[PDB]
């Protein structure tokens, strides 16, 4: 699970080295930045239902064609799975913010996604719409502090880039 | 491998639950005690050769048959291999202490270590003893109570770090013997 | 040259990834810790001649046998090379503190050192004597701050562990 | 590879000089502007897909012959290879910007690129154009003056970082054609 | 691997008997029905993505716990791996149908598949179900009786090809569960 | 370029063998089947402009959303490139039918297609819509013989399966 | 067992591909050529004792030196093993004609033959004599149709080339 | 590699043209004369040992210096390597004849052959001679005018195939010396 | 691997005892009989093909089912593999005889041979028989009492070498069956 | 060229070692045994024409069939090449005895010999007949000493075993 | 265990060859040189306590600094382990002389020695002193014959080179 | 590689001549002086560390610039690489002396050394000096005239061996610069 700690330790392990100065210094980055990302994680934890509902509404408003017969949201069960997916990504973004690395979203959300979405006919632009909406909708310091917002924004941009 | 944070993430994921509230409290403590953790690791790595040679030597002075012909530490090749193993175990324990999770130790070091030792005829009971001495030394360095060496450090409590480190050595020990 | 920066970029490069959160966060570690290590490096550059003389005197005071015919310090030139070597290590430690990693000392001082000293009959304990002396000689806050001292000490312990 | 700090160290080493005084001065400025550097890097990586697709598409709209039969961007395989090269170049430029030194770019990317292109028949002049368009976009994102995207950030002077980022793209461009 | 013809050859060889008379009759029928066999395979490969996604999706809608956290189809990585396995199994069954012998399926696909699944914790019972649905679809396409898709073809009997194909899927199923 | 000929020769070459019976026999397959596939290819080359216009109209009739600002068909030039692409696929299918294998479409159309469409936001379903339409539009024996039709259909199903 | 079917499937399996056009077309070669080779197989099945006797007689007539003390046919048991060998090859040629590839004769007859014959002092020219005789003795359409004869001849030439 | 059909396809692709009309015309002739092509190939492969040994032996009887001390065919190792090269060249020429295009020969055989020979000190002029003798024999077998062997076949004009086979040997010859 | 001398060294080392007195006497005899040992080996290697083919052939004439379809020596591939195994076993026995120790045979040949044979279905009882005949032949050559071949040699006693060689073949036999 | 010297140096080189005791001791073997093998080589060089004529006569006396139309000795030139070949082997044996190893015969005579004789229809038994004759013809102490004879015999048995 | 016999057999085994001339000749080196090395082995066996005592005394006389607090011989138990080490090397040299190769000393004494001595702070020069003293103290023919002495001297030089 | 004996064999082979008479004459001298050759080799290997460290140190004391910043012996890594090259060269010269031919040296050591040095920036003139100092020391040890070491040996003329050893060092030197 990619983080400052695992990245540093894996690099040292590959070289058969005990942790040294730069390894210790890397982790000081954790100590310093945890506050901003944990706040963003916290805000996302306590307000995810709302965040997800809006992102999902945003997606189906921009792509109503999805509700047409044969498309990805041509039934209530499919529409629900769509919001559910948006929630899984937000949950993985929450995890990524807690971990301080993209490990969680990379392994649990991104990996294999292109095959799954291709096989199940889920257009990537629909997810991108959901995420671009959530990102641009972020208001600072109304929703969270500036730096927590930067962390939240980076995480969404990371996920959006994974789809295009 | 996992660290203190992703460990909490894998546990939350099992319930498809976001991380928040109580969960974060445990992790904010980690951050708060981050500097003490960094000193604890620094203390182990800064005295690595001493911790390793003293434990392997301690293992030997308690069981001289290890160096008698036929003993597992007989010949320079075998002594070097044992010294190296000692270093490797301390290196993985120091990784676990830095990460705040035994993941790296379990998967990259302990996984199949006993099998290996049994196959080679490496005496597991002696190994446990070596690990115990390393535990006694490492824990002594973490709390800056090592006899032959004292360092300058902000006074404070590091008992939780000492116990966490001790549990990692204990894990090596129970997986080996 | 191992540092937080090169370690983090090398790991991203090996996985073909753009810098991500954990990469940016590890570098915040540089930002925080630099003050401590740059103070130690600065103290060392300003007073290295004195530090090296003491370390070399400490070495020979402990191992007077090096001055015997056929040993590593059996001539003026040999003794001068000894102090010169301690200076080289101290210079590499200064580099290591500036870089915030062991790269400089690893590549320029440690690598191949064991073959060289074995070939030239240079006892490791003599070098260890010089470095152990310098480390135990450090006086905080007299010579530098606490954290600069911890950085200076780790570097020395790192070099000592390389000959053990 | 080297970073801003080791670059100073290799320069001092050539004169067997300790690093101090005026040398430390520029490194303290580097540290002082570290947060700005991280933002600049974050801006480039956060709009990576946008920067690459727009530059590659831009190279094509100015030289339609690239997609005509026989053009180097003709067939999806070639277009995919071109988009990929664009992303790799931006990735190495972002590494250089993060490190404050072009070492990584020069060694792991530029090192023999022109030769490969000449051997593959990849048009170097078209590549330079894709790179210069990426430069334009990346420099805009760094200063937060991109036409289609504005972000919140503490206002300040990032002119030096953008000139630096620009210098990296120019290096790629000049080593290619 | 063997095909319908070499299968007869390996059986004859066991008795050092030349192939002739009755033996050839079975193989001349193979030739005679060669065109129908080629259509049967074409029908499976031409609807491969549909056959695979529908079965994996069918496996899931019948056992939603597969997609719950902890489920073997939870996370995109796992869903992709399952889709891929589904495709691989259909690919080997289509090879067996083209060859008129299960040899290739047995040796290059089924040999050790159960072991693998048990080790990974892949639910074998769910796998069997996925394979069953694929069987229902493939057999429906072979006989051109698939609901959502009908093709133009010389009218004739292909029941033997449908049963042969069904036996291959059945073989995957009984080797897995 | 994958064909019966190149597949059989590559297998012989890998084993360092001269062409043998099975190699000569597989090529008899070309001899028999060529008539069917060359008829389909010929029909396609003679009527491709019409086939492509219909396929493109079918695509946009189904996904009118592509004409929205920011989508793949939001401008005349974009729409023209869409028809141009369908033409390119149809041209590659003609090549594939002539070669009697998927080599042309594999190497020139399919390879790297997923990275390109992801990067340029070109929804796979639109291409699938165009190809599915063309396939279902085929009328036998009106447009071509039964076997030429089967060959034309397989080629289209092959391209459709590549985006799924 | 090398055949059109296994060669085609192995090539597709190596690339991880489902059978496609060229694979199907290759097998049409089977459908077309089976008649000629199965006839040759059939004729060889029903008349092998005679064929073998003649080939063996042919060999010992051309190389009577074989019956000398110390040679490959210096006893009745050895002479019988010689005809038996000729029969095994004819049986493998029968298999090869049925399979439509050289797989059977390659794996069961050719592979290891050079080591076995070298170790047991069986001159290859004796086998070549047996086979050249059988090949040239073939009379069309008296023994079989022209194409069945071409298949039979190819098979023998394939075996003769394996010995020189 | 390319074959007669894809060769036409790459030529049309350069003009972004569909294949039809006059293009299909020559391919239909290829198909029309397919049986003759298979016989020509069968004739070459069926007398492969004869063609190679006779050409290599022929090269030697015309240039005895090849087997004198220092000659490139001196010692069994070299003679074996020469016979092997002869067989490899005939094998690639037979592939070219089967494919109706020299692509395979050029790419997998001729590609850098002269360079290898020059580096090995393999006499190129002697190689050309071995190749030209193989050409003579192979062309004779194709037309069924070989002095020591005549086969049954439907009589017809195979002049085009023999000129084609001849062109392949000439290509090898001209790329070698 | 070990030889007669290091075998004595490993035994002495087990007691941290220097080699001297009685120990050396055994080894000085080895030296003294060194020439006879060299002849013994030469006799085996000089008649290697004869020893191997005669034993494999002997194994077969006693159990013709080995060459019947389904038999482990049926097909040239299998006969060649058996001939090769026979050669390999004789090669390792000749190494053991040259070294005066079974070390090389045990570690590089016998270690896991039975496992291998059982897995492949190679009949271990027939193998033992092949080895027995090889033993009868090799021992006959060592003592220059082989029927069809006599050599000129200084007359003397080589019974110890014959028995030592026999024990090596016996070792192959009991490890196989 | 395999010899005691090259074998011992190659083993040291592969392990990156300077020559050591066992290397020097193995070469003492050369010193002791050289007399025996150099006598055999000298006898061979002085009387090779006679040895080769006998060996060749022995071959043809045993296999008169080689003189038949189409065989290896069906013409004067062919027969001369046969004696020439026996001479080449005898020359290589002389080289092997001088070098004290099989290197010369291995690389210049044996390597590739099986492909050449198979291709040119040169029966191994004929060569074996020539070498077996020469070996059994040796008369000690008439032709050479006992040990020179053992060396000459081993070399011949080595060449005989290469065709078996 | 490196010796003439194992070196020769390993080389033959790697090439899959039966022992041949050069292998047999190598072992004649054994037969010839065994006398000298076995004598040296014998002399060392019967007089090792004395030899070791002198070498150890030699070491502590030249490096009395070793008895200082913190050094390798700062206690009686450590001093004993020093003589014990010298005895192990002499025992391994005895083994090496018996084996006729450096195998015993390489695997049991040399391998890993540099790591062990570095970790336990045992200066290599102390061992070198012990060995240089034993070597130069050798008196011929007083202690053994000239060649036994050459073998003994080579063995010690081999061990001394392993420490520098 | 070749040795004194095979060198004679390759020379005779070029004239298809048996080795005898005058050819054997020089080889018998080689054998005759074999013990001296073994001593010469033993002298070089027994003082290997001394020869290399003294030559490398000698090269440095004559050219101090080698250890100044930027010098090719600056940093322990480079000094270690230089000492290692010195040892490798002496090792190959000792092999050449043992074999009585420079083949091994030329092929496995000198083969492309200068090119590597030029590419690495290793000073060739300094290397030649280290080699010439090794030559001086090795020639002295061979004749037992080394200033710091004298050994017991049967007195005799070893002038030819020392000139030979010298020729090997000169070959290295001349191929380097």
Curated annotation (Swiss-Prot), chains A, C, F, G, J, K:
InterPro entries: Globin-like_sf, Phycobilisome_asu/bsu, Phycobilisome_asu/bsu_sf. GO terms for biological process: photosynthesis. Keywords: Antenna complex, Bile pigment, Chloroplast, Chromophore, Electron transport, Membrane, Photosynthesis, Phycobilisome, Plastid, Thylakoid, Transport. It holds the Pfam family Phycobilisome. Disulfide bonds: none annotated. (2R,3E)-phycoerythrobilin 1 binds at residues 81-82, 84, 88. It is a peripheral membrane protein. (2R,3E)-phycoerythrobilin 2 binds at residues 47, 137, 139, 142. Its main location: plastid. The keyword Thylakoid applies. The keyword Iron-sulfur does not apply. It is found in: Plastid, Chloroplast thylakoid membrane. SUPFAM superfamilies: Globin-like (SSF46458). GO terms for cellular component: chloroplast thylakoid membrane; phycobilisome. Contains two covalently linked phycoerythrobilin chromophores. The light-harvesting antenna system in red algae and cyanobacteria is formed of phycobilisomes. These are composed of the phycobiliproteins phycoerythrin (CPE), phycocyanin (CPC) and allophycocyanin (APC). Cyanobacteria also contain phycoerythrocyanin (PCC). The phycobiliproteins all share the same subunit composition and organization with variations in the covalently bound open-chain tetrapyrrole chromophores. PANTHER family: C-PHYCOCYANIN ALPHA SUBUNIT, PHYCOBILISOME 32.1 KDA LINKER POLYPEPTIDE, PHYCOCYANIN-ASSOCIATED, ROD 2-RELATED. Belongs to the phycobiliprotein family. Heterododecamer of 6 alpha and 6 beta chains. The basic functional unit of phycobiliproteins is a ring-shaped hexamer formed from two back-to-back trimers contacting via the alpha chain subunits. The trimers are composed of alpha/beta subunit heterodimers arranged around a three-fold axis of symmetry. The phycoerythrins also contain a gamma subunit which is located in the center of the hexamer. Light-harvesting photosynthetic tetrapyrrole chromophore-protein from the phycobiliprotein complex. This is R-phycoerythrin alpha chain. The lineage of its organism: Eukaryota, Rhodophyta, Florideophyceae, Rhodymeniophycidae, Ceramiales. The gene is cpeA.
From Swiss-Prot, chains B, D, E, H, I, L:
The gene is cpeB. Contains two covalently linked phycoerythrobilin chromophores and one covalently linked phycourobilin chromophore. Phycourobilin binds at residues 50, 54, 61, 147-148. The modification N4-methylasparagine is found at residue 72. It is a peripheral membrane protein. (2R,3E)-phycoerythrobilin 2 binds at residues 35, 39, 158. This is R-phycoerythrin beta chain. It is found in: Plastid, Chloroplast thylakoid membrane. The keyword Chloroplast applies. Light-harvesting photosynthetic tetrapyrrole chromophore-protein from the phycobiliprotein complex. It comes from the Eukaryota. It comes from Griffithsia monilis. Keywords: Antenna complex, Bile pigment, Chloroplast, Chromophore, Electron transport, Membrane, Methylation, Photosynthesis, Phycobilisome, Plastid, Thylakoid, Transport. (2R,3E)-phycoerythrobilin 1 binds at residues 72, 77-78, 82, 84-85. It holds the Pfam family Phycobilisome. InterPro entries: Globin-like_sf (IPR009050), Phycobilisome_asu/bsu (IPR012128), Phycobilisome_asu/bsu_sf (IPR038719). The light-harvesting antenna system in red algae and cyanobacteria is formed of phycobilisomes. These are composed of the phycobiliproteins phycoerythrin (CPE), phycocyanin (CPC) and allophycocyanin (APC). Cyanobacteria also contain phycoerythrocyanin (PCC). The phycobiliproteins all share the same subunit composition and organization with variations in the covalently bound open-chain tetrapyrrole chromophores. GO terms for biological process: photosynthesis. Heterododecamer of 6 alpha and 6 beta chains. The basic functional unit of phycobiliproteins is a ring-shaped hexamer formed from two back-to-back trimers contacting via the alpha chain subunits. The trimers are composed of alpha/beta subunit heterodimers arranged around a three-fold axis of symmetry. The phycoerythrins also contain a gamma subunit which is located in the center of the hexamer. The keyword Coiled coil does not apply. GO terms for cellular component: chloroplast thylakoid membrane; phycobilisome. Its main location: plastid. Belongs to the phycobiliprotein family.
């Amino acid at each position: 699970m990619k983080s400052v700690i695992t990245t540093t330790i894996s690099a040292a392990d590959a070289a058969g080295r005990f942790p040294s100065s730069s390894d210790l210094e890397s982790i000081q980055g954790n100590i310093q930045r945890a506050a901003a990302r944990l706040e963003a994680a916290q805000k996302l934890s306590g307000n995810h239902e709302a965040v997800v509902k809006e992102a999902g509404d945003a997606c189906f408003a921009k792509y109503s064609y999805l509700k047409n017969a044969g498309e990805a949201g041509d039934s209530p069960e499919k529409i629900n799975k769509c919001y559910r997916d948006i929630d899984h990504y937000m949950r993985l973004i929450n995890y990524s913010l807690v971990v301080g690395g993209t490990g969680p979203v990379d392994e649990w959300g991104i990996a294999g996604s292109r095959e799954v979405y291709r096989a199940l006919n889920l257009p990537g632009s629909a997810y991108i719409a959901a995420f671009t909406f959530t990102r641009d909708r972020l208001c600072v310091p109304r929703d969270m502090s500036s730096q927590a917002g930067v962390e939240f924004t980076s995480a969404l941009d990371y996920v959006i880039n994974s789809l295009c | 491998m996992l660290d203190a944070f992703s460990r909490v993430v894998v546990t939350s994921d099992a319930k498809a639950a976001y991380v928040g509230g109580s969960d974060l409290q445990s992790l904010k403590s980690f951050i708060n005690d981050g500097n003490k953790r960094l000193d604890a690791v620094n203390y182990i790595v800064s005295n690595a050769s001493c911790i390793v040679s003293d434990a392997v030597s301690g293992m030997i002075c308690e069981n001289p048959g290890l160096i008698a012909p036929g003993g597992n530490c007989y010949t320079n090749r075998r002594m070097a291999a044992c010294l190296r193993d000692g270093e490797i175990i301390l290196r993985y324990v120091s990784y676990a202490l830095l990460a705040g999770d035994s993941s790296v130790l379990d998967d990259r070091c302990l996984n199949g270590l006993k099998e290996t030792y049994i196959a080679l005829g490496v005496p597991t009971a002696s190994s446990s003893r070596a690990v115990s001495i390393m535990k006694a030394t490492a824990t002594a360095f973490i709390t800056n109570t090592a006899s032959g060496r004292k360092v300058e450090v902000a006074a404070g409590d590091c008992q939780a770090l000492q116990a966490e480190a001790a549990s990692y050595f204990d894990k090596v020990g129970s997986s080996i013997d």
